[PDB]
Amino acid sequence: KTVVVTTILESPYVMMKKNHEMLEGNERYEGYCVDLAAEIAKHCGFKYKLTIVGDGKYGARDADTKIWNGMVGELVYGKADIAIAPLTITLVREEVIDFSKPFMSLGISIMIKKGTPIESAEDLSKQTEIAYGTLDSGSTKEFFRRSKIAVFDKMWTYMRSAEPSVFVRTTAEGVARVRKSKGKYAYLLESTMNEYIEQRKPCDTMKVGGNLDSKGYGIATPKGSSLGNAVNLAVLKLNEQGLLDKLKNKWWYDKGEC
Amino acid sequence: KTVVVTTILESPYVMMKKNHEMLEGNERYEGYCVDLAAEIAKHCGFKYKLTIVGDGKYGARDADTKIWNGMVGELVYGKADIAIAPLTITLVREEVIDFSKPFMSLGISIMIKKGTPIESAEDLSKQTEIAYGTLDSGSTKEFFRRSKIAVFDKMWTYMRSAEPSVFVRTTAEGVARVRKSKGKYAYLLESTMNEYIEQRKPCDTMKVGGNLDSKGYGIATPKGSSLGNAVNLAVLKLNEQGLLDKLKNKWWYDKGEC
Ligand SMILES: N[C@@H](Cc1conc1O)C(=O)O
Ligand SMILES: N[C@@H](Cc1conc1O)C(=O)O
Ligand SMILES: [Zn+2]
Ligand SMILES: [Zn+2]
């Protein structure tokens, strides 16, 4: 009955506490999703164990093997009971796992090194000098790959053929590339992460333009799991009681450094 | 077999076309939810009949009889098969009906007549010359009635006992009250309607401040319904293809008059 929670090391959702090495179990981690996991568990009445997804991914179906990787795979193949992370609710995922109503709203956004002469996706598409990419698996890449909006189709056409690769394995990798490229690389990531980074030292990046789309993160469970109903209701209750807005402010803005 | 769709006359979601008297059935109406209903039915493969909710309400439970009114009641008591409307996903409603994932995100906002000395809820709570209320039943009124947050708790106390009533029966009545009250009345309504009206003639109102919460509208079905699954998947598909964004620009800003 101890619920195995799969999640991912992604700031400020789940981060290692500075002393984690002298701590045990759930106490080793801190962050928005660590706080949310505690509350979901308390309102649903279950004991849980946080575990970091082994391959460090969000989740995508390999087109050859057709095997799901990341947190989605952990749920699909029975290695975890629930996923509490910045996991995007999408059609292909909803087809294999269950999602609660969203606990956070977001949209794909553009992250630039300050001073970059870019102001929108249209600007990125109309030039070639500043390279741009996305996480190499997950909802953002899939959004561009399936987009039929020309500004986005043009962007995908370029990204899928750019060399060296413009895709990165982790959010941190994308942010570092932005920071170390003197303005020649812009990163396409979720508004939530983009807004977070813009508030952290060295305060050299910023989110530009509006969001490209609109969607949410949901707490996921294995298709038909017994936890789904209570978890969904708990998210709604916690949102209505102001918990979610409080956690957003606590982890994004209250200890912002810029 | 023809699906009975319950919806509500609320601009620009569902409105009577100018020439509706000489039109019939579903053709009499136009709007975002009318376009959405057509997109959902096509993907889920069903024929439908649009019907305006009899009592003109969104849906709330009478504390004494425990009977649901509005579109929620029409689903609860079997008078309709699905509600395609700007119906807000809430915990009390989710307990009695099913909601698809969000097709639109929004938040409670403040509508003022241009030039009114108000910039936030807080601003409304610390004065008494400017009355302010909400729709008479629905998710907004509940929000203030259930607030564990100080500014808002203060707002319910004044609202619940103001006399005469600061509550209104329809969004239109709330908007008209703002407009003819020479700035002595502000109306609390969802950002979607607020932003919409703000872009319509006589262009004398405006949304002030930020949203008070974050939530969404969902397509609702009776508990356990055969349509729940397909509808939910259709919403996600429509969002990802950009149809939902397309419809929003179509009905909100493409014809704006200010
Ligand atoms: N939440 C996303 C991952 C993600 C995080 O930030 N940009 C992204 O693409 C997912 O679920 O793939
Ligand atoms: N969407 C709300 C109603 C509503 C619309 O605009 N302000 C409101 O309160 C509901 O479903 O009750
Ligand atoms: Zn379609
Ligand atoms: Zn009564």
Closest C-alpha to A223, from A54, A77, A85: A77
Query: B196 CB contacts (<8 Å, ≥6 apart)?
Result: B11, B12, B251, B252
Q: Is residue B73 left, alpha or beta, with left meaning phi > 0 and alpha meaning psi from -120 to 50?
A: alpha
CA dihedral over A212, A215, A219, A224, signed as positive or negative:
negative
CATH, domain range B1-106+216-255: 3.40.190.10
- The answer to whether the CB atoms of A91 and B215 lie below 8 A apart is no
Residue B157's identity, in one-letter code, is T
Is the C-beta atom of A190 inside 6 A of ligand 1?
A: yes
Q: Is the peptide bond before B202 cis (omega within 30 degrees of 0)?
A: yes
Residue from A139, A168, A170 whose mutation best tests the ligand 1 pocket (most atoms within 8 A of CB)? A139
Tell me which H or E stretch contains A18.
Answer: none
Query: A22 CB contacts (<8 Å, ≥6 apart)?
Result: none
Phi/psi of residue A159, nearest 5 degrees: -55, -45
Residues A130, A59: Cα–Cα separation, whole Å: 28
Report the CATH superfamily, name and number, of domain A107-215.
Answer: Periplasmic binding protein-like II (3.40.190.10)
Q: How far is A90 from chain B (nearest CA, A)?
A: 7
The β-bridge relationship of strands B29-30 and B15-16 is: antiparallel
3-state secondary structure of B257: coil
Report the structure determination method: X-ray
Distances in whole angstroms, Cα of residue A96 to Cα of each of A60, B59, B69, B230: 11, 32, 36, 14
- Give which of A96, A105, A147 to mutate to test B binding, by max B Cβ within 10 Å: A105
CA B17-B222-B54 angle, 5° bins: 40
CB B111, CB B207: distance < 8 Å: yes
- The answer to whether the CB atoms of A94 and B241 lie below 8 A apart is no
Burial of A69 (0-12, 13-18, 19+ CB in 10 A): buried
- Domain boundaries of chain A, sorted by first residue: 1-106+216-255, 107-215
Question: What SS3 string covers A110-162?
Answer: EEEECCCCCCCHHHHHCCCCCEEECECCCHHHHHHHHCCCHHHHHHHHHHCCC
Residues A174, B35: Cα–Cα separation, whole Å: 39
- Distance from Cα A197 to the centre of ligand 1, integer Å: 14
Is the C-beta atom of B6 inside 6 A of ligand 2?
A: no
To 10 degrees, the CA torsion angle through B59, B64, B65, B71?
Answer: 0
How many CB atoms are closer than 10 A to CB B24? Answer: 8
Residue A114's identity, in one-letter code, is K
Same fold flag, B1-106+216-255 and B107-215 = yes
Residues B125, B24: Cα–Cα separation, whole Å: 47
Q: How many helices (H) and strands (E) does chain B have?
A: 10, 13
Q: Is the peptide bond before B12 cis (omega within 30 degrees of 0)?
A: yes
Distances in whole angstroms, Cα of residue B185 to Cα of each of B29, B115, B131, B173: 31, 12, 5, 12
B224 touching A (Cβ < 8 Å)? no
A240 touching B (Cβ < 8 Å)? yes
> From atom 5 of ligand 2, which residue's Cα is the shortest distance away?
B190
Buried b / exposed e over B216-240, threshold 16 CB at 10 Å, is bbbbbbbeebebbebbbbbbbbbbb
Phi/psi of residue A208, nearest 5 degrees: -120, 145
Q: Is residue B33 left, alpha or beta, with left meaning phi > 0 and alpha meaning psi from -120 to 50?
A: alpha
Residues A201, A183: Cα–Cα separation, whole Å: 17
- What is the DSSP secondary-structure string of B99-111? E-S-SEEE-EEEE
Closest C-alpha to B127, from B151, B94, B160: B151
Residues B11, A253: Cα–Cα separation, whole Å: 36
